[PDB]
Nucleic acid binder design. Sequence first.
DNA 1: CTCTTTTTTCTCG
DNA 2: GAGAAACAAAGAGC
Length: 266
Amino acid sequence: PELPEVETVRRELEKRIVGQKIISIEATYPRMVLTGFEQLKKELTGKTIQGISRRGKYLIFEIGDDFRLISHLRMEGKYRLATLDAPREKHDHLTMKFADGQLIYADVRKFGTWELISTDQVLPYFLKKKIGPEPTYEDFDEKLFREKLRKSTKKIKPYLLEQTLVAGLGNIYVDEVLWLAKIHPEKETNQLIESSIHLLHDSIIEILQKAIKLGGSSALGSTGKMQNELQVYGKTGEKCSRCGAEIQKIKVAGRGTHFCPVCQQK
DNA sequence: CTCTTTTTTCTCG
DNA sequence: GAGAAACAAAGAGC
Ligand SMILES: [Zn+2]
């Protein structure tokens, strides 16, 4: 999940579990609770879910008066709302049981994480992670973005993936954004001119907001439509919609990287 | 059979 | 920065 997929999950959870009292919590893989499973079970059992927020790719359950459960889905994490009698599935790891159903977390690769912290610890938690601004016109200041790009020799794709210039891009939307902005993923950032940086800035906001509107690319969130709008990601060998050149795939800083060699000049 | 492929954060040099 | 670890599964190829 990237930011649009996490936001989609957030919205669905907000609609359905806000106001629910947690009756019990069970784990078959307690080790994914980085702050300690038995501790979380003791603290949250009997508390009511008050809200669900998001920061970058992180989900934040607001529970009780002053608890915040920070959940990261990493590569394959999936939530679903199931009946209390639902059968166990192979990669289900945790469940919060309510009176009329349960929220189950599954993750084939076991990468996803849960951390229980307090309300006043949330802002420091994200400062420590060095997460950059949300991708909105209000929060994503082009001027600082420009200054950071000017002073780095990092390649644009991996720098964007750091979450530090702006929060929320993963492999799919970084590839999509760079195609939209006509920038090659290996471009050193200090080579980008002002007009390119402006187009990149706006393209990041536009692509992510579009993906949110379309419910993400493809349990909660599994109804997305953004996948039908992808121009390069996973489109190796197909033709660029703009110029007709074949989309190419290369490896950049360890990641599969899809681009048009005409539209995105090296 | 081996090798490659698919978010974050570490070690290494 | 480069490479790989955390982990599981699927596909290609010998
Ligand atoms: Zn093109």
